[PDB]
Each structure stands twice: as C-alpha cells, then as structure tokens.
Amino acid sequence: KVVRQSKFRHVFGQPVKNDQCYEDIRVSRVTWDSTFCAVNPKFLAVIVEASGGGAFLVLPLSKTGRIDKAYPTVCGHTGPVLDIDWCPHNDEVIASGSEDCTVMVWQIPENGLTSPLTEPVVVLEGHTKRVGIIAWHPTARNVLLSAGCDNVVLIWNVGTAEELYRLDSLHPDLIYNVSWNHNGSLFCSACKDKSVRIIDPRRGTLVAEREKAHEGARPMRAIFLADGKVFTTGFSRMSERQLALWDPENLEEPMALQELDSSNGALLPFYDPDTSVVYVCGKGDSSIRYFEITEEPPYIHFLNTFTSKEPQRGMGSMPKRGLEVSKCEIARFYKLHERKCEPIVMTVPRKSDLFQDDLYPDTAGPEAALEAEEWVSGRDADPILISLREAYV
Amino acid sequence: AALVVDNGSGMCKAGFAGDDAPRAVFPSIVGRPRHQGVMVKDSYVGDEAQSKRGILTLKYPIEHGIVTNWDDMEKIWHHTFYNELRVAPEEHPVLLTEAPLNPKANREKMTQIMFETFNTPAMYVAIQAVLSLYASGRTTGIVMDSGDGVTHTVPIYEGYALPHAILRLDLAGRDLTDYLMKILTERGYSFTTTAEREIVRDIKEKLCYVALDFEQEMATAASSSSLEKSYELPDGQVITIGNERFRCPEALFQPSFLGMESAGIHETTFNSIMKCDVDIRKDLYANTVLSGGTTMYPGIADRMQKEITALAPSTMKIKIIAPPERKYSVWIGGSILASLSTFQQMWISKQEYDESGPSIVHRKCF
Amino acid sequence: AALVVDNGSGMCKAGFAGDDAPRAVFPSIVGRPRHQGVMVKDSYVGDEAQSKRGILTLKYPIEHGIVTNWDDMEKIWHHTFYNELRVAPEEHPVLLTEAPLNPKANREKMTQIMFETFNTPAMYVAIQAVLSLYASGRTTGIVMDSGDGVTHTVPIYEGYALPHAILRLDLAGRDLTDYLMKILTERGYSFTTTAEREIVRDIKEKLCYVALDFEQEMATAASSSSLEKSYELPDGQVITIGNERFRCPEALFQPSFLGMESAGIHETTFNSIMKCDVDIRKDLYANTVLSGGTTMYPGIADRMQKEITALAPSTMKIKIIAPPERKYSVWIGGSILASLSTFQQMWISKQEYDESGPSIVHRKCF
Amino acid sequence: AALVVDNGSGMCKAGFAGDDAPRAVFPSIVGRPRHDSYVGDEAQSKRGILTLKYPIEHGIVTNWDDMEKIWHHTFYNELRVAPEEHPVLLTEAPLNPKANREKMTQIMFETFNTPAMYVAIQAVLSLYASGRTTGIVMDSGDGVTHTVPIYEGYALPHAILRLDLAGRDLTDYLMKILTERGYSFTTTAEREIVRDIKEKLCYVALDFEQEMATAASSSSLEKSYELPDGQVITIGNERFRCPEALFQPSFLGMESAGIHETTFNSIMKCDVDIRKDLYANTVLSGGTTMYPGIADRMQKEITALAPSTMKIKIIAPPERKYSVWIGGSILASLSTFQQMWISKQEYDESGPSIVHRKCF
Ligand SMILES: Nc1ncnc2c1ncn2[C@@H]1O[C@H](COP(=O)(O)OP(=O)(O)O)[C@@H](O)[C@H]1O
Ligand SMILES: Nc1ncnc2c1ncn2[C@@H]1O[C@H](COP(=O)(O)OP(=O)(O)O)[C@@H](O)[C@H]1O
Ligand SMILES: Nc1ncnc2c1ncn2[C@@H]1O[C@H](COP(=O)(O)OP(=O)(O)O)[C@@H](O)[C@H]1O
Ligand SMILES: [Mg+2]
Ligand SMILES: [Mg+2]
Ligand SMILES: [Mg+2]
C-alpha cells in the first residue's frame, strides 16, 4: 500500500566491459534523428560515414574489440543512409532507407561480410524525397512500410517488389516516426504539425487524430503499446520535454502528462511489450529513463534512471530472443558514442538463480503468422509466441 | 504516517513524519541487575534503566558509532516501537539514519532486522549529515555533527556529497564525559560506576561551556570565584566545580588532553574543506553547520568562528550556522524528507527486499 | 535584425547586426557532474558551468578548431539563441563565422544544423580572417588571428584571398594555458583538474605579457622582484608568479618550448607573405592585422614588429596594426558586413537549401 | 668510492657505487615525541610515542630542516661515512624545479662539504638498470607517479605526464576502507601498520568486477595479518580494492585517468615514428609497481588502448623497487661518467649556474 506494487522498481543499468564493446566505428553524422542502430540476436547494424554515397556497418555480435577501418560495409546507396531495421522474421534480412529516395533490402551471409556488399536483393523505389522511416510489419511476412519527406506512406512487398497501398493525402507536414500496433492492423505517426494520427493502411482512412498533442515546435514521437494505447513524447510551449499516454477511444485529454526537464534533443522511446516498460532516451543526453505503463493512475510510474558521462549519438535495443535469460535480463541497449558502440545491461536484482517465470512471459517469435497476400485480403492475427525457458542455461 | 528513527550512540530520537520535534527522546542504554533479589525483568531499556540505575549496570550498545552487541540493539528498537512510540512497526514505514561512510555490513544488519524481526512494510536509510542540512534549508555547506560516539565533517556542495573529503574524529560526548571524571577526581569527587556516568554526563550538560580564550579563562578562574558553580547530587550532596567547566569541552579543540594525536574539531573542519575542490571552498566557509548534542555548549559557535578564521585566508568570510534546535537537526531533517512528495520513490518494500536481498538497499542510497 | 554568431574554440560571441559589441560573450564549454546527488539538470553550458565548475568535468566541444562532439556543439548554439540572446532562431537570419580552409564536411554540418534543428530563415558563413579585415576598414593586409584552438595567417590583397599562402599553426591560447599549468608546478602550485584549467586561464589573461627581449627579462627576473605579481585564488589563497608571466606567451614565438618543431607566429606570418606574389608583399608588410584573444597580451605588437623587421628586407616598412578591440574583431566585422546594403544578396534561404542541398553553400562562399 | 643516494618520498636508499643492492634502505620519516627527534628506523621502532611526519609530500619539500636530518642520517648513521670524502650522486624527479635542485646542491656543498656531486633524473637511471636506451618509464613511488618516454637516449619533456596518485594515496585509501570492516587506524603510527599491510597482502586483479564476485561468494581470497600488539585481523576484497585506485582514480574522488591511460597518453604525445618502440619497452619502476599481477593488468589495459598491430610488452624486472638506485650505481661506475662530476671548488666560484647546465 505504501509502495506501488511492481517488479522493476530496482532495475539498474550496467555498461558492459571494454573488451566486449565495439571500437573504431565511424558513427554517422547525419542530423536526422533516428536510432542509428539496429540489432538482432545474430548481427549488429550501425549507420556509418562513407566517403561517397552511404553505407552501414553490419558485424556479428561476437566480433568485439576494435574494428578494422577497412572492414567491409554495406555500401550500395548513392546517398547517406538514414534508417536501418532488421527483419523480425528473418535474422539475415535488413531494410535501409537513404537520401537517394530509395529503399533497399539486403541479405547478410551467416558469417557476415567478407567483401563490401553493393548489390541488394530488391530495390524499392516509390518515393520522391529522402526516406527516413522504415518499419517492418510485426506479423505480416515480407510486408514493409516506408515513409519519406514527401509526406507519403507506402506499403511494400519485399518478396515481390510490389507497392500494396499508397497513403499520400494524410500527412500535411514532415513525418517524425511511424510505429505499428500489436497485431499490425494500424500504425501511429507523429507529424511536424504537432498532430498524432492513427491510420488504417488497408482501408486508407484516419481512424483517430489528436491535434496539438504537444505544444512545442520541437520534434515529437509516438508509438503503439500492447493494449492499444499510444505513448507520445514531445515538448510543451515552454520548451519542456513531456511524456503522454493517449487513448484512441477518447483523445480529448491524455491519461497522463509528465514533464522531465528542459534539455534539447528529441526523446526516443523504446517500449518493451512484455514488461510494459518504456525506455525514454534522448539524443545527445547521457542518461536513460525508464517508466512502467500500468492501469493504476497516474498510468506513468518513473522507475529509475541510468546515468553516464558520455552523450549518446544512437541507440539500439536487442529483442527478447537475444537476451541472456540466466542473469535476469530484460533489456540490452547498444548505446552509440561518436566512435564506439557500448552495450548496456539492464537487470532485475533477484536472489534466485533459477528461471524467473514472472519476468519472462511468452514473446513474439521469428515466425510470421500471416503472409503478404493473406494480410491484404483482410486477415488479422497476433504474433506467434515462443518460450524463453529453453534459452535458460 | 511514516516513522523517523534516529539511533545515536547515546540518545535515540523517534517520532512521526511531519512533526517538528521528536516524540520520544530516551538514552540508548541497557541495564542489567548486578545484585541478587531477595524479595519474591532481567534487563531495562531507556528511561526505566535510568531511574533504577542504582542497582543496574548500564551498557551502551553503540560505542564509537559501531554496534558492539546487536542483541541489546534490538531491545533499543523494540522499546522504541512498542513502549515509547506505542505503534505497530508492521504498519508504518520507517525512515532510518546512518553515520557517514557507514560500513555496508552495518547497514545490511540494520535493514534485515527491520524487515525480518519487526516486519516493517517499507524502509529507507539516509546519511545523518544530509538530514542536518535539510533542517537548515540549505543545499551547500559542510556539516560537522558531534554526537555521543564520533564526530563527522561532511562537505556537501549543491546537493552533491564529497565522500573523499569526509573526515572522522574519534572524540565525542562520551569521551568528554569520561574526561570530566578524570579531572573531577582532582577536586576530590570520585565517580567510577556506570551509574555515576549519567550523573557526570548531566553535570556536563548543565555547567560546561566553551571559553573564547582558554588561557585567559584559566587566569580568571585561578584568581576569582565568579566562574564557580554548584550542582546537587541525587543524594542531596552539593559539589562545586571551577575551571573544570571549560576544561572538559576544551578537549574538542585540543585532543592532546586525552592523549590523542588527532587535531581538534576546528582543524578537522578546516582540513575537510581543504580536501575539496578550490572553486567550492568559498561557499563551505560561509555555510558551516553544527549538529549534534556535543555542539550545544555555550560559546562553542564563537570559538569555532575565531579558530577557523585564524586558519582560513583573510579574504574568506567565516559563518558558523548554529540553529538553537541543532540537538535534533538530524531528526528534524528526517521528518522533512519523509514528508516531501518527491521521497515516496525512495521507499524500499519488504516484498522487494525478500526477492532481491540487500543489493537494492546498497543502491538507492549513498 | 540579423544575428552574428562567432563560434570559437574557447569563447562564443553573439549579438545583433548593427551593434558595436557582442551582447553575449560566454565560454564554449559543457560541464557534467562528476559526483553523486545525495539531496532532492545533467549538463551545464556557458557561464552556468563556470559558476558550478567545482563539481563538474568541463569539456570543450571544439578542439584545435575541430568539433570533437556535435551533441555538445548544439548545446552551445541552443544556449546562445534561447538563454543568452533570448531570441527565436527561426525569426532572424544568422551569420556564422568559419575558420580559414575549413573542411567542406564541417561547413556541411554547420549549415545542416541551422536549417533543420534551429530552422533559421536565412544563413551565411563568412571567413573569420575576412571579417577581421572589415572591422579595421581595410581591403589589403595579412590577418594573423590567434584564438583558443589554432593560429591562422591569411593574406588578402585588394579583396582577393590567396588560399595557397594560408598557413596554419597548431598553437593557441589553450596550448599556452596547458603550458602555464606545467610551469606553475615548478613554483609549487598544482593545477590538474579541468576546473583548475579555467583558474590558470584567468591568471594568464591578467598577469601574462610578451617580453620585448626574452633573455634580458629572464636576467631581470632572476636578479629582481619587480616582475613578480600576486593573484588571489577563488578560495582566498594568494599565489605569486615571477618569470612565468612572460615565459608562457614566449611559447608563441618559440614553439620548441612545447616540443613543437613548427616556427613561431612571427616567422609563420613572414612565411605566409613570402608565399604570395612578389608585387603584393610590400602592402602586406605595412598592413599586418592582429586578431583574436591570444594577441591581447601587452607588448605583443612591439615584439611582432621587432621580429618581422629582422626577417623582412631593411627597406620594407613593417606596421603591425593591433586595434584595442581586436578580441572581437571577427564579430565586429561580422556586424559591419551583415548591415551593408550590398550583403543581402548573399543570404541563403531555408527554402533554397531544402530543394538544392549543400551545393549552394559551397558556392556563394569562399 | 662514490655514494649513490636516491631520495624518495617514503624510502631513502643509499649505498656505494659498484654495488648491486642498496646498503641502507630506511623510511624517510621524522618523528617527534608527543608525550628531541627521531629519523628513519629509529623513529620506526619508537613510533609508539612519536608523531611521524614525512619531509617530502608529493615530491615537494615541505620542511628543509627535516630534510637535512634525513641526509645527516644517511651519511653518519646509516652509511657511516664522511660526506666530505666521497662523491655523492643524487637523484631527482622528472621536471624537477630549478629551485628544488638548487637547494639540494646548496645543502650538499655547504652543509656536508661533499667534494663532488651530480644530479640525475630518476627515470633515466631506471632505464640503465634494465639495459635499454629506448622506452617509456612509469616510475610510481610514494608521492607522485610519472611517465617519461625515452627514445635512443633522448628525453622528451613535452610528453612527460605526472599523476598525483601514488603509494601514500593508496595507504590512505586502505585506512578509509579498513574502517568499513571494523578496524580503525587514525594515528601516524598506525599509518605504517597499514602500509605494512599493503606491502604484504595487496595485489592487482586481472579483472576487478569478477574479483568482487568471488570475494562476495567465497572465502578463498581472505588473508590474516598480525598486528604488533597481537590481535589478528582479516581482510577480504580490500586486498585488491586498494591497488585498484591506480587504474580507477575515481575511487579517491580524483578526476584524472588511471596509470594505464596516463602511460598511453604519454605515448600518444610522442612522435608517430617512435610510438611502436615505446609500446614494446614499457618499463615499470618504483615500489608502487611491486603488486603481484600489476604487469598482467598493465598489459591487458594498454593493449585495449593501443592499436591491434602493436606489441605491448610490459617490462617488470623483479628488482624494480631499486631500479633507480641500481641504475645510479652503474652510472657512478662507468668510465664515461667522470666528466659529469661537479667539483666543490667549481661551485663556490660559479654557483648553481653550472648545475642547471650539465644536467637535464
Ligand atoms: N546541552 C548540552 N550541553 C552539552 N552537551 C550535551 C548537551 N545535550 C547533550 N549533550 C551531549 O551530547 C551527547 C550526544 O547527544 P546526541 O547529539 O543526541 O548524540 P547522538 O547523535 O549519538 O544521539 C550526549 O552524550 C550528551 O552528553
Ligand atoms: N587579455 C588577455 N590576455 C591574454 N589572453 C587572453 C586575453 N583575453 C583573451 N585571452 C585568451 O584568448 C583565448 C581565445 O580567445 P578568442 O579570441 O575569443 O578565441 P576564439 O576565437 O576561439 O573564440 C582565450 O583562451 C583566452 O585565454
Ligand atoms: N611489495 C610491495 N607491494 C606493494 N607496495 C609496496 C611494496 N613495497 C613498497 N611498496 C610501496 O611503494 C611506495 C614507494 O616506494 P618507493 O618506490 O621506495 O618510493 P620512493 O621512490 O618515493 O622511494 C611505499 O609507500 C610502499 O608502500
Ligand atoms: Mg547523531
Ligand atoms: Mg576566433
Ligand atoms: Mg622513486
């Protein structure tokens, strides 16, 4: 009664030892506010500076220590790469959007790159301006979303290079980010006009919209939660960075509205559906704050903050399948410095050395539930869940 | 309603969060009979031991800030909850205080007893020097607390503590009380038993003071009787003390009186500041905060200002902040912190401690 | 109302076009706490980091004229517009200054930040050496600007710049500040922390001067106490420095003191003149213009004139122009240029940059 | 017969030229009664009632009168020789202020009337004992830690780095953490007991976090030490936590980097063409580098900093505690060294101008 009931109030961060980091990485200097890092249980992908065009560095997780300056990179784009994202149903497939107004999907060999990779599997061209937002569908196989500076959203079939749907008359200004929902039937988007929209791609209609979700002129974000709510970070009129929870059934007022501080840089939220924990990380900040999303008011409970001494240029989150369960792992973050990638360890302090059933519910697996053709017809399915108990050692 | 417990070496202050003064202030002693009963309770704690001290052997469970015997320590806490506060410990969260640079082993026992023996719903431990700064409403200053067991000098700047600059002095009220006995036998009064320890301690709290000029005060006391005071013993006998009034507190500034090689409290405060960064020494000079019962002597603030000024550079402004309620500064600061709306995120649950252990109390604290 | 922002290695000067002095002059540092908070903002920039520097680790986002961290660089700019100037960057054109022979990648990032992060309506980048000539009201002369990171010698004749004759010297105020710290330990004063770096920089700006003849002053300082001065530390301590007053600035003319094999600023200026055409060397000799804070040492003009005269032919007239406001010459020249009626054709619109890219800013600039 | 005297912050080693080990090693401690003065081991035996003071703090003289007592103790009480009959070779810290060197020269020639005298840099002598002319010497003594790169006999002062963190700071840190176990040491007499503990039971762990894990879940890493008055105290993780302040100065509230990074930074300040040879000739010196496992930890840490193609080789001779003294003895025996001697008759007519030259 005195203390709010939770399992994550004492989660603490712990940077990994130096010998397990990744040094000598020319991290990208693109002003675009993306994650700059995508990681799966097999590989690590980091956007880097190339002398000409654009490239991103893909290396196996075991390839720790210093990285050769001449290490092969995925240099196929004629412009700098903006966003990268691994395929949730294929650990060797990664999509990338760049300044060249094209989206490329690559196939990574099981051992990585021995020679620079220039030819992509398929070239997605549907945009007139740069593409900075790429989001794989959570359940539909070979379905990819692309959003560019031309304020148009496209649904892609990487299997057949076919444009399923085109959404061009729904965003009047710049798109900040796009996130699918739990079952992937809808997606939320934060726009430069300070408006948050929930859009159905199959029907091409605006399900819900909230104008002036945040009064500030600085960029804002919006993600979908497991229960169907939308978590948004933004700025107020007084340049105050804020967090907010929204209900698609009544957008008149947010359930919660909490201010954090008066710093610059957008807030990049990392949501963990199993633990209902959102990790709010600011670009250029040296601290990571994580909050627990619950039904009890004020619906946003600050847990704790990991603090460091180096500003972050990018950050990537390992999915549930890649964490080491035996040491009470809930999240591992690959914080990006200017010349180094430092994994970050977040644990729940537990006395028992056995498997924790409550900490690890079933997670979405690498098996796609639906297919591209079935998804277009009107089928909706939840992701296939797997058990992490087999990963316990 | 949260409980604020300040367990010192000599005194234990307890109360409720939000109040202005501790509700229960009793000595931290445990007494056991030393004679045989001939007429048809094997231990006494607190004031009940003080009243019957004529037949008891008084023992302090805390000595020099370390817990000599935990079995009597639990009796002190048991007396606090059930006999003094008269509340159920399993209903109210408890805010606890610890000495600066407290050993983690000592902290582990303190939280384990609360969660397992008394079954408190929530618990938290805070540094006594920090609360003493809360009571004065400051965010920057060097806190020199002087209780019964030990003396600490903790410089804090803008809410940031400097552990490397924290200094310790094994010299406090109990050492002064023992020193007063050694010089009282010079005048012909013999106090030897532990029962007489409280009598001498009461004399120190009522007749002792700090002289601005120690050598001059000897000259005045050696040629005049204006400095002599009379005290009535519990048996009705009246004793008179002269220069012993200000010679006993002088051990704080001249530890050589006790054969100690360490420096006085004024130099310990000065040495603590010099161990800090140069850019913050200016604010620490003007925010010297006194704490504890051993800093309640008359004229101790004036002597402290004079001594530090002679050590500090002439261009610095020395300010000795001595609030009149500094005897309860730690508890008052504890009540203030336990009432703030930003402190409820620091509580450590009993359930959380069961599944995590003492790893979570080492964190979330300093 | 156009904004003129001069981002240097050590100081950032900002103001409004048409003014005579920068309205905001604050150090270009970012400070982060290095202790733990024990009582109820993770970064401090500008003067705020200077007032709390006793508990922060000060970092310069620009080192040797190279931006080592762009996340810290945007903090300095954000502090400039919103905290120092207290203006909206999206409502005023901003005129930026750049080092000579600036990398095209560095200019790309500067242009990109202003247009996408701050959304400035108009923007233009000007060469710092060219702006320094505007403030002196000249179109011909060699500008030897020495700031905090790097020393440049840029010859300009009749409004035409000679890029092939631009020489770079990796020796500036920050290198002198570090050298002063090394030689201060020879007098018994130890400054090691980044907080103490600013104190030594304050000593350098107040008690250092350039000796007309280095060897004759060393004999004077070793046989007299007339060159000794006293400085008061923030904690009230007083330090006395003797020959260190002119030994630190002497490193500018004798880089071998820091182990550097490059020539002094006097020879670098002479070498830059000799790299130009023979016909224009006469005018550059008589229009040597000094700029930057590192040229504010008393007696630096006469020493420069004395050294260059020994290198130049006897019939050439050496005239070192050192205006008393040369510390802000780059900014004042920026204010003059930004107010000219013929300059509005050089502005680069945000809409133009969005549709054209950084190709338009590489052109229309030098 | 020439004398070699290496004056350190804590220990002053003295002996005769041509020998292999110092004949006289005693703590540089001046003690005075607190209930008329004692110097060296005579103060160490009577430290029960004495107030021990170090005349040197952080390689800086705080009281020259006590310093003359240390030198008077060396010549007459330990070496048992007349200072006016033997040339004496002195050792100096890197970047030694000319004022400090002058006082050393003035005292030797005027108070002790030595016939000949020479001052040598401690880092240079440390390299002679290892038989090398190229390498970076990381001499960590009692007061201060220095990193002096050397290439083909040429010294590079601009690349010399100083760390205000040495044996005394570790000893003071050990006392602070020993109170966390329940043992209180406060007097200057108890400082020597803690220093004796540090020299016997402390070591450097290859990994620090892992060494915490085994010490927090096993009792294999605890050791017992006997106090002079008979009580036996046991220490666990304090054995390797105290030396860890060398690699993590943040434990002491210090902002500067560890001794591994200081060594790397001193190399980084050198020219590019000589960095390869400095990586392969990293020489350890001083008593603070005698912790077991300090060489392995140094190699692992510097290798993580240096590029993968450079061979890190930490040279830690077993007698590195006296490398400065041993190097001085070899120099005092070389035939090419006799022209370095500075005569007393030369000094009284010329002054300290001749000792500022002919030295480095
Ligand atoms: N008015 C007073 N004058 C002098 N000494 C006092 C006075 N009041 C209390 N003391 C001394 O202060 C000592 C400790 O008091 P306190 O500050 O409560 O210590 P603790 O923090 O250990 O409880 C007691 O031993 C007592 O002798
Ligand atoms: N009066 C002065 N005397 C000596 N040095 C000065 C003086 N004023 C400024 N400086 C030095 O000039 C350096 C750089 O100043 P500035 O010209 O503003 O550099 P930047 O062009 O990088 O902003 C500072 O580090 C400061 O130490
Ligand atoms: N075996 C050892 N292990 C760890 N530390 C030691 C050992 N022997 C000596 N020391 C420490 O080395 C420090 C300095 O020794 P030394 O190199 O003689 O210093 P200096 O060069 O100032 O004479 C001493 O404070 C001592 O505590
Ligand atoms: Mg107390
Ligand atoms: Mg400049
Ligand atoms: Mg030595």
Side-chain angles (χ1 to χ4, degrees), chain D residues 6-9 11 13 122 139-142 144 285-287 321 324:
Chain D
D6 154 23
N7 49 215
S9 301
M11 264 58 78
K13 315 99 195 170
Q122 291 164 358
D139 39 3
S140 189
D142 168 9
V144 76
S285 180
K321 193 193 296 184
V324 174

Side-chain angles (χ1 to χ4, degrees), chain A residues 22 150 205 217 260-261 303 345 348:
Chain A
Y22 310 91
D150 41 359
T205 52
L260 306 186
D261 51 75
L303 298 175
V345 174
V348 201

Side-chain angles (χ1 to χ4, degrees), chain D residues 221-276:
Chain D
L221 280 293
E222 51 76 22
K223 287 297 185 64
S224 290
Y225 181 88
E226 184 180 346
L227 298 182
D229 80 24
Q231 326 156 270
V232 175
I233 74 172
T234 200
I235 59 177
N237 51 7
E238 293 88 2
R239 298 179 58 204
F240 53 90
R241 279 172 57 204
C242 161
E244 222 66 18
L246 290 170
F247 303 90
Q248 302 191 45
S250 58
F251 286 175
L252 314 184
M254 281 185 28
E255 151 185 9
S256 58
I259 85 169
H260 64 295
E261 210 155 9
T262 303
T263 301
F264 175 75
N265 288 336
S266 191
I267 298 177
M268 261 318 331
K269 287 183 177 298
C270 278
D271 295 34
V272 51
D273 313 278
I274 79 175
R275 295 170 190 161
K276 182 192 185 62

